[PDB]
Coordinates of C-alpha atoms in Angstrom, one line a residue:
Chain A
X2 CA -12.1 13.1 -19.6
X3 CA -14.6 11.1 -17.8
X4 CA -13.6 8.4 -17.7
X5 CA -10.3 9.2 -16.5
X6 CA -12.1 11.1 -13.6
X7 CA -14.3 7.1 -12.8
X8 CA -10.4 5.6 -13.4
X9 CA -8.7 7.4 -10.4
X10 CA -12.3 6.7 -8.4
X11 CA -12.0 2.9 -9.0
X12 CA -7.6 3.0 -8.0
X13 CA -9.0 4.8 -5.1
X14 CA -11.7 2.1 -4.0
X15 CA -9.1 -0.8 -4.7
X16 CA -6.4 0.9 -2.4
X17 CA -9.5 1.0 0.1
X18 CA -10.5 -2.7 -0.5
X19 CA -6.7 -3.1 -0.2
X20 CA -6.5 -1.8 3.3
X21 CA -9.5 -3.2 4.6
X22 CA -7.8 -7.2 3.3
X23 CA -4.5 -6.1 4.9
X24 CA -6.4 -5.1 8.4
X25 CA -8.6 -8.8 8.1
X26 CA -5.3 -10.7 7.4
X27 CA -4.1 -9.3 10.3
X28 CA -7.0 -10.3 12.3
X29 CA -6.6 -13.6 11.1
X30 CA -2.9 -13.5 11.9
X31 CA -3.4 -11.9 15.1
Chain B
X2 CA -15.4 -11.9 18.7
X3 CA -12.4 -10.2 17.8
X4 CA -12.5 -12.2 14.5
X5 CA -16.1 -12.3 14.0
X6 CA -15.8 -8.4 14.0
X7 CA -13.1 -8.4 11.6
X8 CA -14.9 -10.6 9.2
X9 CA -17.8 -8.2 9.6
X10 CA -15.4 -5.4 8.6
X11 CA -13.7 -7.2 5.5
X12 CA -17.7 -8.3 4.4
X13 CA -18.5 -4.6 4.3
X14 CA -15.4 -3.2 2.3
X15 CA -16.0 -6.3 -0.1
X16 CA -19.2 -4.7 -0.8
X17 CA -18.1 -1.3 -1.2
X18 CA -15.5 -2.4 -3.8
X19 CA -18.3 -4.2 -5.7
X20 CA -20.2 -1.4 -5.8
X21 CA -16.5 0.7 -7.0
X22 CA -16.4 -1.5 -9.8
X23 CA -19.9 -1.7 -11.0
X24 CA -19.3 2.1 -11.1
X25 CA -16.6 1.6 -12.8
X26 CA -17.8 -0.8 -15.7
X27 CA -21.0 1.5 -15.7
X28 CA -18.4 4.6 -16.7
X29 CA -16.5 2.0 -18.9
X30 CA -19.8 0.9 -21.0
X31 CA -21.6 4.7 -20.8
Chain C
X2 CA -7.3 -0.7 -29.2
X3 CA -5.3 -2.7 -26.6
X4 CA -6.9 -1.2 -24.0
X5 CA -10.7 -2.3 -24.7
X6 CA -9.0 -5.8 -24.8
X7 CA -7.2 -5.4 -21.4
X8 CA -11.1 -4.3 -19.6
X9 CA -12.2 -7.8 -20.9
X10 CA -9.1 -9.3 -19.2
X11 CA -9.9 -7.8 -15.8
X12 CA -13.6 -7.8 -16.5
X13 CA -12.6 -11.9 -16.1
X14 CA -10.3 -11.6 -13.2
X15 CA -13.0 -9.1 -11.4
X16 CA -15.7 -12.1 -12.3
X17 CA -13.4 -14.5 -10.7
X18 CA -12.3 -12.9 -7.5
X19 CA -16.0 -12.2 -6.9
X20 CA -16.5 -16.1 -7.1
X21 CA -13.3 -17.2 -5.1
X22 CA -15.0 -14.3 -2.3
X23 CA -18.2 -16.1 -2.4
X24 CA -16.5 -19.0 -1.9
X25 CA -14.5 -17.8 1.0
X26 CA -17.9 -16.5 2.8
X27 CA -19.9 -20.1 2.3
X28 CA -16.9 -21.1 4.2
X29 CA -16.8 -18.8 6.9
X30 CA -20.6 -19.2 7.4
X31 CA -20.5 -23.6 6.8
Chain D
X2 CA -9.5 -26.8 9.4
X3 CA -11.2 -27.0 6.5
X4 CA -11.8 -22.8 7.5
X5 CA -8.0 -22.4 7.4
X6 CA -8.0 -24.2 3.8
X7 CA -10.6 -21.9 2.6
X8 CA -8.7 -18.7 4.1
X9 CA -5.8 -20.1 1.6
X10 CA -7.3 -20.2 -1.4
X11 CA -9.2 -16.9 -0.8
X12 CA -5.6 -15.4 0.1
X13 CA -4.4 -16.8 -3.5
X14 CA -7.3 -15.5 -5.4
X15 CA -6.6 -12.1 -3.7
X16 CA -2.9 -12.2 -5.4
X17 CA -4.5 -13.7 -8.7
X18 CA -6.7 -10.8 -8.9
X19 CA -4.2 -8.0 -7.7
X20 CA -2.0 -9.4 -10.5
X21 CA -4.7 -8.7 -12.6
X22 CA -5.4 -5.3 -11.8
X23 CA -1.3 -4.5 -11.8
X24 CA -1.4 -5.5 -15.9
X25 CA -4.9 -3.8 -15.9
X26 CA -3.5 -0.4 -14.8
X27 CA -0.3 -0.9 -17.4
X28 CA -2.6 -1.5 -20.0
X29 CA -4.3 1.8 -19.2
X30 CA -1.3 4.0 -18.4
X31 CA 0.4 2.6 -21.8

């Protein structure tokens, strides 16, 4: 249902908010 | 800078991910 | 069920990640 | 320095939290 739907939304934005730490740490890093 | 850039970057997705889990706990609580 | 206990869990985990991150950006900006 | 410390403990509280989501999503898949 619904909120299964706003579930696989909110996996989605923490893989994003993943990437986006992984490409600072870099940064750092780098 | 390069770094000053990045930290820009990794302030923005913070924010978006915020948002993503306000949605979230807004779908959670509805 | 087990679940509704689990959201609390993160809900707290969510509540402190935002706090280590505002944290992190007094630091970057002091 | 002091910058460097601060980009530690943010770094741990990223792991806290993706631990946190990892037994989050269990919870929810189980």
């Amino acid at each position: 249902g619904e909120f299964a739907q706003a579930y696989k939304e909110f996996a989605k934005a923490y893989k994003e908010f993943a990437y986006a730490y992984k490409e600072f740490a870099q940064a750092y890093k780098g």
